Amino acid sequence: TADVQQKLAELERQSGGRLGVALINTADNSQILYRADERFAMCSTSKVMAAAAVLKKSESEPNLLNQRVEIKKSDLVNYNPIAEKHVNGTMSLAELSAAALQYSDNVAMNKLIAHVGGPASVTAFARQLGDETFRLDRTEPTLNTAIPGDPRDTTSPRAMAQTLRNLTLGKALGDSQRAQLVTWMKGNTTGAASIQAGLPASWVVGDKTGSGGYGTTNDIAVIWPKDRAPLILVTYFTQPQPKAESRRDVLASAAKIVTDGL
Ligand SMILES: *C(=O)C/C=N/[C@@H](C(=O)O)[C@](C)(Cn1ccnn1)[S-](=O)=O
Ligand SMILES: [Cl-]
């Protein structure tokens, strides 16, 4: 409706930044879109695609998720809450996937990237899903710079919502692998202040947040509203000032606006 559009435009104006929203309502294959074809830096929301690429690879490599990966001091980057505990030992690729998705561990993301063949291999995976917009170009920590005008490590809200639908609700992944991705995302520990904060307490959410330079504040989610078919929601947000603070409340407000009535 124009109503939801006016409300998102007002939210964007109040926030002072640039807001991108894509909601897919699977009850009727409908969408609510706001700047949904513009590019935004994904930041840690890209961890979903890296984990999914590993899961895809595991469909033909049944030992992949159990493969042991050494964690070294030389791997630490910024923000390694889980990997720090395992320095000089190994973690399995399953453990690294869980750490990347549930604690936003950056070392874990770098190991996923390395074990599928680098950023361009994650991008090639996206192309196999029919996503010709996503691009992963750097490793952690630099993929989060989020400089205005820089297309590196960006996607659009529309593309990411469609891809998330395919990964979590469709059959881009096999039965076991899709269930694993959804279980990992439902177990996220870092998302309560973002999309979830704009939804009723009873709704079930699997999400992945991200943040970065220019006050970039993001969340992507699969949502099961009480007694309704699932939704996919992408909320991306970025600001004009390099040192702007995160605005998770803007994502919560966007979620409340677009799910009002559901
Ligand atoms: C996922 O979104 C991980 C984001 N990490 C960045 C952040 O939280 O802002 C870090 C910690 C800080 N940063 C801002 C710009 N470039 N980096 S990045 O160092 O991991
Ligand atoms: Cl409630």
PDB file of all heavy atoms in Angstrom, residues 209-241:
ATOM      1  N   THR A 209      22.291 -10.833  11.521  1.00  0.00           N
ATOM      2  CA  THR A 209      22.544  -9.399  11.523  1.00  0.00           C
ATOM      3  C   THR A 209      23.908  -9.084  10.904  1.00  0.00           C
ATOM      4  O   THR A 209      24.744  -9.965  10.667  1.00  0.00           O
ATOM      5  CB  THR A 209      22.505  -8.830  12.944  1.00  0.00           C
ATOM      6  OG1 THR A 209      23.391  -9.587  13.776  1.00  0.00           O
ATOM      7  CG2 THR A 209      21.106  -8.912  13.542  1.00  0.00           C
ATOM      8  N   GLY A 210      24.128  -7.793  10.659  1.00  0.00           N
ATOM      9  CA  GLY A 210      25.455  -7.306  10.328  1.00  0.00           C
ATOM     10  C   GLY A 210      25.569  -5.836  10.652  1.00  0.00           C
ATOM     11  O   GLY A 210      24.570  -5.122  10.780  1.00  0.00           O
ATOM     12  N   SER A 211      26.805  -5.391  10.805  1.00  0.00           N
ATOM     13  CA  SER A 211      27.083  -3.968  11.003  1.00  0.00           C
ATOM     14  C   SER A 211      28.451  -3.651  10.419  1.00  0.00           C
ATOM     15  O   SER A 211      29.284  -4.534  10.194  1.00  0.00           O
ATOM     16  CB  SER A 211      26.956  -3.545  12.456  1.00  0.00           C
ATOM     17  OG  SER A 211      27.879  -4.254  13.213  1.00  0.00           O
ATOM     18  N   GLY A 212      28.680  -2.373  10.162  1.00  0.00           N
ATOM     19  CA  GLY A 212      29.943  -1.980   9.585  1.00  0.00           C
ATOM     20  C   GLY A 212      30.117  -0.482   9.564  1.00  0.00           C
ATOM     21  O   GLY A 212      29.450   0.256  10.296  1.00  0.00           O
ATOM     22  N   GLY A 213      31.037  -0.027   8.712  1.00  0.00           N
ATOM     23  CA  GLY A 213      31.313   1.390   8.612  1.00  0.00           C
ATOM     24  C   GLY A 213      30.095   2.176   8.176  1.00  0.00           C
ATOM     25  O   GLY A 213      29.102   1.624   7.697  1.00  0.00           O
ATOM     26  N   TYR A 214      30.166   3.489   8.368  1.00  0.00           N
ATOM     27  CA  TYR A 214      29.067   4.379   7.998  1.00  0.00           C
ATOM     28  C   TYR A 214      27.781   4.004   8.729  1.00  0.00           C
ATOM     29  O   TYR A 214      26.681   4.184   8.217  1.00  0.00           O
ATOM     30  CB  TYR A 214      28.914   4.455   6.476  1.00  0.00           C
ATOM     31  CG  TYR A 214      30.048   5.231   5.860  1.00  0.00           C
ATOM     32  CD1 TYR A 214      31.287   4.642   5.622  1.00  0.00           C
ATOM     33  CD2 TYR A 214      29.901   6.578   5.557  1.00  0.00           C
ATOM     34  CE1 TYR A 214      32.328   5.361   5.083  1.00  0.00           C
ATOM     35  CE2 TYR A 214      30.950   7.302   4.999  1.00  0.00           C
ATOM     36  CZ  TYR A 214      32.164   6.687   4.773  1.00  0.00           C
ATOM     37  OH  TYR A 214      33.228   7.375   4.228  1.00  0.00           O
ATOM     38  N   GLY A 215      27.918   3.486   9.952  1.00  0.00           N
ATOM     39  CA  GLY A 215      26.742   3.160  10.740  1.00  0.00           C
ATOM     40  C   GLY A 215      25.854   2.131  10.078  1.00  0.00           C
ATOM     41  O   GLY A 215      24.643   2.098  10.332  1.00  0.00           O
ATOM     42  N   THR A 216      26.439   1.261   9.261  1.00  0.00           N
ATOM     43  CA  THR A 216      25.656   0.282   8.531  1.00  0.00           C
ATOM     44  C   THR A 216      25.115  -0.729   9.528  1.00  0.00           C
ATOM     45  O   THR A 216      25.849  -1.218  10.401  1.00  0.00           O
ATOM     46  CB  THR A 216      26.504  -0.369   7.448  1.00  0.00           C
ATOM     47  OG1 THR A 216      26.896   0.642   6.499  1.00  0.00           O
ATOM     48  CG2 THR A 216      25.718  -1.439   6.703  1.00  0.00           C
ATOM     49  N   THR A 217      23.816  -1.009   9.414  1.00  0.00           N
ATOM     50  CA  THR A 217      23.092  -1.840  10.366  1.00  0.00           C
ATOM     51  C   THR A 217      22.095  -2.667   9.565  1.00  0.00           C
ATOM     52  O   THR A 217      21.188  -2.092   8.951  1.00  0.00           O
ATOM     53  CB  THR A 217      22.348  -0.955  11.383  1.00  0.00           C
ATOM     54  OG1 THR A 217      23.184   0.098  11.879  1.00  0.00           O
ATOM     55  CG2 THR A 217      21.913  -1.792  12.572  1.00  0.00           C
ATOM     56  N   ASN A 218      22.244  -3.994   9.584  1.00  0.00           N
ATOM     57  CA  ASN A 218      21.523  -4.883   8.689  1.00  0.00           C
ATOM     58  C   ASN A 218      20.939  -6.079   9.431  1.00  0.00           C
ATOM     59  O   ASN A 218      21.447  -6.506  10.469  1.00  0.00           O
ATOM     60  CB  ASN A 218      22.471  -5.465   7.623  1.00  0.00           C
ATOM     61  CG  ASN A 218      23.081  -4.417   6.714  1.00  0.00           C
ATOM     62  OD1 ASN A 218      22.510  -3.344   6.477  1.00  0.00           O
ATOM     63  ND2 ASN A 218      24.233  -4.757   6.141  1.00  0.00           N
ATOM     64  N   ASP A 219      19.922  -6.686   8.827  1.00  0.00           N
ATOM     65  CA  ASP A 219      19.373  -7.956   9.316  1.00  0.00           C
ATOM     66  C   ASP A 219      18.624  -8.619   8.172  1.00  0.00           C
ATOM     67  O   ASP A 219      17.963  -7.939   7.392  1.00  0.00           O
ATOM     68  CB  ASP A 219      18.432  -7.706  10.511  1.00  0.00           C
ATOM     69  CG  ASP A 219      18.176  -8.944  11.384  1.00  0.00           C
ATOM     70  OD1 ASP A 219      18.856  -9.989  11.209  1.00  0.00           O
ATOM     71  OD2 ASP A 219      17.299  -8.826  12.266  1.00  0.00           O
ATOM     72  N   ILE A 220      18.745  -9.941   8.066  1.00  0.00           N
ATOM     73  CA  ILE A 220      17.979 -10.740   7.120  1.00  0.00           C
ATOM     74  C   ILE A 220      17.356 -11.886   7.897  1.00  0.00           C
ATOM     75  O   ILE A 220      18.014 -12.480   8.758  1.00  0.00           O
ATOM     76  CB  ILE A 220      18.836 -11.226   5.925  1.00  0.00           C
ATOM     77  CG1 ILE A 220      19.863 -12.310   6.258  1.00  0.00           C
ATOM     78  CG2 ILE A 220      19.527 -10.010   5.271  1.00  0.00           C
ATOM     79  CD1 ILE A 220      20.630 -12.852   5.027  1.00  0.00           C
ATOM     80  N   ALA A 221      16.091 -12.197   7.600  1.00  0.00           N
ATOM     81  CA  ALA A 221      15.354 -13.125   8.431  1.00  0.00           C
ATOM     82  C   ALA A 221      14.344 -13.951   7.652  1.00  0.00           C
ATOM     83  O   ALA A 221      13.712 -13.478   6.703  1.00  0.00           O
ATOM     84  CB  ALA A 221      14.593 -12.364   9.533  1.00  0.00           C
ATOM     85  N   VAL A 222      14.165 -15.190   8.121  1.00  0.00           N
ATOM     86  CA  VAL A 222      13.002 -16.013   7.817  1.00  0.00           C
ATOM     87  C   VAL A 222      12.137 -16.012   9.080  1.00  0.00           C
ATOM     88  O   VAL A 222      12.651 -16.159  10.199  1.00  0.00           O
ATOM     89  CB  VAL A 222      13.387 -17.419   7.310  1.00  0.00           C
ATOM     90  CG1 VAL A 222      14.292 -18.151   8.268  1.00  0.00           C
ATOM     91  CG2 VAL A 222      12.142 -18.233   6.996  1.00  0.00           C
ATOM     92  N   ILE A 223      10.830 -15.799   8.903  1.00  0.00           N
ATOM     93  CA  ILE A 223       9.921 -15.527  10.009  1.00  0.00           C
ATOM     94  C   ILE A 223       8.703 -16.424   9.865  1.00  0.00           C
ATOM     95  O   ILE A 223       8.078 -16.462   8.801  1.00  0.00           O
ATOM     96  CB  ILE A 223       9.450 -14.056   9.981  1.00  0.00           C
ATOM     97  CG1 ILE A 223      10.626 -13.072  10.086  1.00  0.00           C
ATOM     98  CG2 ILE A 223       8.434 -13.779  11.086  1.00  0.00           C
ATOM     99  CD1 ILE A 223      10.285 -11.698   9.611  1.00  0.00           C
ATOM    100  N   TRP A 224       8.314 -17.075  10.955  1.00  0.00           N
ATOM    101  CA  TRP A 224       7.046 -17.793  11.026  1.00  0.00           C
ATOM    102  C   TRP A 224       6.111 -17.033  11.955  1.00  0.00           C
ATOM    103  O   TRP A 224       6.210 -17.170  13.191  1.00  0.00           O
ATOM    104  CB  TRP A 224       7.261 -19.221  11.515  1.00  0.00           C
ATOM    105  CG  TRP A 224       7.907 -20.074  10.478  1.00  0.00           C
ATOM    106  CD1 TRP A 224       7.276 -20.866   9.551  1.00  0.00           C
ATOM    107  CD2 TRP A 224       9.309 -20.226  10.248  1.00  0.00           C
ATOM    108  NE1 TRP A 224       8.204 -21.490   8.761  1.00  0.00           N
ATOM    109  CE2 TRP A 224       9.459 -21.119   9.168  1.00  0.00           C
ATOM    110  CE3 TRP A 224      10.454 -19.697  10.847  1.00  0.00           C
ATOM    111  CZ2 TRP A 224      10.708 -21.501   8.687  1.00  0.00           C
ATOM    112  CZ3 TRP A 224      11.689 -20.074  10.370  1.00  0.00           C
ATOM    113  CH2 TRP A 224      11.809 -20.980   9.308  1.00  0.00           C
ATOM    114  N   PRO A 225       5.211 -16.206  11.426  1.00  0.00           N
ATOM    115  CA  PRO A 225       4.230 -15.550  12.299  1.00  0.00           C
ATOM    116  C   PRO A 225       3.287 -16.584  12.883  1.00  0.00           C
ATOM    117  O   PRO A 225       3.060 -17.643  12.302  1.00  0.00           O
ATOM    118  CB  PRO A 225       3.477 -14.592  11.360  1.00  0.00           C
ATOM    119  CG  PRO A 225       4.251 -14.584  10.069  1.00  0.00           C
ATOM    120  CD  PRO A 225       4.942 -15.925  10.008  1.00  0.00           C
ATOM    121  N   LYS A 226       2.729 -16.271  14.042  1.00  0.00           N
ATOM    122  CA  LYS A 226       1.785 -17.188  14.658  1.00  0.00           C
ATOM    123  C   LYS A 226       0.655 -17.500  13.682  1.00  0.00           C
ATOM    124  O   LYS A 226      -0.022 -16.595  13.186  1.00  0.00           O
ATOM    125  CB  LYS A 226       1.233 -16.579  15.940  1.00  0.00           C
ATOM    126  CG  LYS A 226       0.266 -17.503  16.653  1.00  0.00           C
ATOM    127  CD  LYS A 226      -0.304 -16.850  17.885  1.00  0.00           C
ATOM    128  CE  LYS A 226      -1.351 -17.740  18.537  1.00  0.00           C
ATOM    129  NZ  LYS A 226      -2.136 -17.009  19.569  1.00  0.00           N
ATOM    130  N   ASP A 227       0.471 -18.786  13.393  1.00  0.00           N
ATOM    131  CA  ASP A 227      -0.648 -19.288  12.600  1.00  0.00           C
ATOM    132  C   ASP A 227      -0.661 -18.781  11.159  1.00  0.00           C
ATOM    133  O   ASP A 227      -1.731 -18.738  10.535  1.00  0.00           O
ATOM    134  CB  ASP A 227      -1.993 -19.006  13.281  1.00  0.00           C
ATOM    135  CG  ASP A 227      -2.165 -19.781  14.575  1.00  0.00           C
ATOM    136  OD1 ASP A 227      -1.672 -20.928  14.651  1.00  0.00           O
ATOM    137  OD2 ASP A 227      -2.790 -19.244  15.509  1.00  0.00           O
ATOM    138  N   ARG A 228       0.503 -18.439  10.605  1.00  0.00           N
ATOM    139  CA  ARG A 228       0.564 -17.944   9.239  1.00  0.00           C
ATOM    140  C   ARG A 228       1.742 -18.554   8.490  1.00  0.00           C
ATOM    141  O   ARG A 228       2.718 -19.016   9.086  1.00  0.00           O
ATOM    142  CB  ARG A 228       0.749 -16.420   9.202  1.00  0.00           C
ATOM    143  CG  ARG A 228      -0.308 -15.607   9.914  1.00  0.00           C
ATOM    144  CD  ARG A 228      -1.656 -15.632   9.203  1.00  0.00           C
ATOM    145  NE  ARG A 228      -2.509 -14.560   9.707  1.00  0.00           N
ATOM    146  CZ  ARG A 228      -2.673 -13.371   9.125  1.00  0.00           C
ATOM    147  NH1 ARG A 228      -2.066 -13.083   7.982  1.00  0.00           N
ATOM    148  NH2 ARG A 228      -3.462 -12.468   9.690  1.00  0.00           N
ATOM    149  N   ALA A 229       1.655 -18.507   7.159  1.00  0.00           N
ATOM    150  CA  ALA A 229       2.764 -18.925   6.335  1.00  0.00           C
ATOM    151  C   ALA A 229       3.969 -18.018   6.557  1.00  0.00           C
ATOM    152  O   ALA A 229       3.843 -16.844   6.957  1.00  0.00           O
ATOM    153  CB  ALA A 229       2.375 -18.860   4.864  1.00  0.00           C
ATOM    154  N   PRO A 230       5.159 -18.525   6.269  1.00  0.00           N
ATOM    155  CA  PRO A 230       6.358 -17.746   6.568  1.00  0.00           C
ATOM    156  C   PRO A 230       6.537 -16.511   5.693  1.00  0.00           C
ATOM    157  O   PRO A 230       5.991 -16.367   4.586  1.00  0.00           O
ATOM    158  CB  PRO A 230       7.506 -18.748   6.370  1.00  0.00           C
ATOM    159  CG  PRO A 230       6.953 -19.817   5.538  1.00  0.00           C
ATOM    160  CD  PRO A 230       5.492 -19.917   5.886  1.00  0.00           C
ATOM    161  N   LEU A 231       7.362 -15.613   6.227  1.00  0.00           N
ATOM    162  CA  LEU A 231       7.808 -14.410   5.563  1.00  0.00           C
ATOM    163  C   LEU A 231       9.322 -14.468   5.425  1.00  0.00           C
ATOM    164  O   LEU A 231      10.026 -15.117   6.219  1.00  0.00           O
ATOM    165  CB  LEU A 231       7.485 -13.161   6.402  1.00  0.00           C
ATOM    166  CG  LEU A 231       6.090 -13.087   7.019  1.00  0.00           C
ATOM    167  CD1 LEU A 231       6.001 -11.888   7.940  1.00  0.00           C
ATOM    168  CD2 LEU A 231       5.035 -13.012   5.958  1.00  0.00           C
ATOM    169  N   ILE A 232       9.833 -13.723   4.447  1.00  0.00           N
ATOM    170  CA  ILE A 232      11.253 -13.385   4.356  1.00  0.00           C
ATOM    171  C   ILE A 232      11.350 -11.874   4.469  1.00  0.00           C
ATOM    172  O   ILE A 232      10.594 -11.163   3.805  1.00  0.00           O
ATOM    173  CB  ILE A 232      11.860 -13.858   3.027  1.00  0.00           C
ATOM    174  CG1 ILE A 232      11.801 -15.377   2.889  1.00  0.00           C
ATOM    175  CG2 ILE A 232      13.306 -13.342   2.883  1.00  0.00           C
ATOM    176  CD1 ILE A 232      12.749 -16.127   3.789  1.00  0.00           C
ATOM    177  N   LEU A 233      12.257 -11.382   5.308  1.00  0.00           N
ATOM    178  CA  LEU A 233      12.427  -9.946   5.459  1.00  0.00           C
ATOM    179  C   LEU A 233      13.910  -9.597   5.455  1.00  0.00           C
ATOM    180  O   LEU A 233      14.691 -10.128   6.246  1.00  0.00           O
ATOM    181  CB  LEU A 233      11.799  -9.447   6.763  1.00  0.00           C
ATOM    182  CG  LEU A 233      11.930  -7.945   7.037  1.00  0.00           C
ATOM    183  CD1 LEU A 233      11.346  -7.092   5.936  1.00  0.00           C
ATOM    184  CD2 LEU A 233      11.247  -7.637   8.363  1.00  0.00           C
ATOM    185  N   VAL A 234      14.269  -8.646   4.598  1.00  0.00           N
ATOM    186  CA  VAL A 234      15.597  -8.041   4.558  1.00  0.00           C
ATOM    187  C   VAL A 234      15.445  -6.566   4.902  1.00  0.00           C
ATOM    188  O   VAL A 234      14.644  -5.860   4.271  1.00  0.00           O
ATOM    189  CB  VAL A 234      16.264  -8.200   3.175  1.00  0.00           C
ATOM    190  CG1 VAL A 234      17.540  -7.374   3.071  1.00  0.00           C
ATOM    191  CG2 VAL A 234      16.521  -9.684   2.921  1.00  0.00           C
ATOM    192  N   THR A 235      16.220  -6.104   5.881  1.00  0.00           N
ATOM    193  CA  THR A 235      16.269  -4.692   6.262  1.00  0.00           C
ATOM    194  C   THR A 235      17.735  -4.276   6.294  1.00  0.00           C
ATOM    195  O   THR A 235      18.492  -4.743   7.148  1.00  0.00           O
ATOM    196  CB  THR A 235      15.617  -4.429   7.631  1.00  0.00           C
ATOM    197  OG1 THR A 235      16.236  -5.212   8.665  1.00  0.00           O
ATOM    198  CG2 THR A 235      14.150  -4.722   7.631  1.00  0.00           C
ATOM    199  N   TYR A 236      18.125  -3.409   5.366  1.00  0.00           N
ATOM    200  CA  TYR A 236      19.475  -2.870   5.266  1.00  0.00           C
ATOM    201  C   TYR A 236      19.425  -1.370   5.544  1.00  0.00           C
ATOM    202  O   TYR A 236      18.473  -0.683   5.151  1.00  0.00           O
ATOM    203  CB  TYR A 236      20.007  -3.126   3.854  1.00  0.00           C
ATOM    204  CG  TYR A 236      20.444  -4.567   3.565  1.00  0.00           C
ATOM    205  CD1 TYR A 236      20.722  -4.974   2.280  1.00  0.00           C
ATOM    206  CD2 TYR A 236      20.665  -5.493   4.587  1.00  0.00           C
ATOM    207  CE1 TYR A 236      21.227  -6.247   2.027  1.00  0.00           C
ATOM    208  CE2 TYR A 236      21.162  -6.782   4.323  1.00  0.00           C
ATOM    209  CZ  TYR A 236      21.434  -7.134   3.044  1.00  0.00           C
ATOM    210  OH  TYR A 236      21.964  -8.389   2.754  1.00  0.00           O
ATOM    211  N   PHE A 237      20.443  -0.854   6.221  1.00  0.00           N
ATOM    212  CA  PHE A 237      20.426   0.549   6.593  1.00  0.00           C
ATOM    213  C   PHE A 237      21.860   1.065   6.637  1.00  0.00           C
ATOM    214  O   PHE A 237      22.744   0.400   7.175  1.00  0.00           O
ATOM    215  CB  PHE A 237      19.753   0.738   7.956  1.00  0.00           C
ATOM    216  CG  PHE A 237      19.700   2.179   8.405  1.00  0.00           C
ATOM    217  CD1 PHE A 237      18.924   3.106   7.706  1.00  0.00           C
ATOM    218  CD2 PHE A 237      20.428   2.617   9.491  1.00  0.00           C
ATOM    219  CE1 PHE A 237      18.893   4.435   8.082  1.00  0.00           C
ATOM    220  CE2 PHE A 237      20.386   3.954   9.877  1.00  0.00           C
ATOM    221  CZ  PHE A 237      19.627   4.854   9.174  1.00  0.00           C
ATOM    222  N   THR A 238      22.094   2.266   6.110  1.00  0.00           N
ATOM    223  CA  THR A 238      23.425   2.859   6.173  1.00  0.00           C
ATOM    224  C   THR A 238      23.292   4.376   6.253  1.00  0.00           C
ATOM    225  O   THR A 238      22.242   4.939   5.942  1.00  0.00           O
ATOM    226  CB  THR A 238      24.276   2.385   4.987  1.00  0.00           C
ATOM    227  OG1 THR A 238      25.649   2.710   5.210  1.00  0.00           O
ATOM    228  CG2 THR A 238      23.824   2.996   3.685  1.00  0.00           C
ATOM    229  N   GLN A 239      24.350   5.037   6.699  1.00  0.00           N
ATOM    230  CA  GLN A 239      24.296   6.433   7.101  1.00  0.00           C
ATOM    231  C   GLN A 239      25.389   7.241   6.436  1.00  0.00           C
ATOM    232  O   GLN A 239      26.360   6.686   5.917  1.00  0.00           O
ATOM    233  CB  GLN A 239      24.407   6.522   8.625  1.00  0.00           C
ATOM    234  CG  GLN A 239      23.235   5.843   9.299  1.00  0.00           C
ATOM    235  CD  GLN A 239      23.341   5.873  10.784  1.00  0.00           C
ATOM    236  OE1 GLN A 239      23.128   6.911  11.396  1.00  0.00           O
ATOM    237  NE2 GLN A 239      23.688   4.750  11.388  1.00  0.00           N
ATOM    238  N   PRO A 240      25.268   8.569   6.439  1.00  0.00           N
ATOM    239  CA  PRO A 240      26.239   9.371   5.682  1.00  0.00           C
ATOM    240  C   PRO A 240      27.578   9.554   6.373  1.00  0.00           C
ATOM    241  O   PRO A 240      28.576   9.843   5.693  1.00  0.00           O
ATOM    242  CB  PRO A 240      25.522  10.707   5.445  1.00  0.00           C
ATOM    243  CG  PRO A 240      24.373  10.716   6.332  1.00  0.00           C
ATOM    244  CD  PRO A 240      24.057   9.332   6.806  1.00  0.00           C
ATOM    245  N   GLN A 241      27.638   9.421   7.692  1.00  0.00           N
ATOM    246  CA  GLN A 241      28.852   9.743   8.442  1.00  0.00           C
ATOM    247  C   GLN A 241      29.707   8.495   8.633  1.00  0.00           C
ATOM    248  O   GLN A 241      29.192   7.460   9.079  1.00  0.00           O
ATOM    249  CB  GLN A 241      28.507  10.309   9.818  1.00  0.00           C
ATOM    250  CG  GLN A 241      27.604  11.531   9.791  1.00  0.00           C
ATOM    251  CD  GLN A 241      26.125  11.223   9.804  1.00  0.00           C
ATOM    252  OE1 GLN A 241      25.705  10.062   9.796  1.00  0.00           O
ATOM    253  NE2 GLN A 241      25.319  12.272   9.796  1.00  0.00           N
TER     254      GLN A 241
END
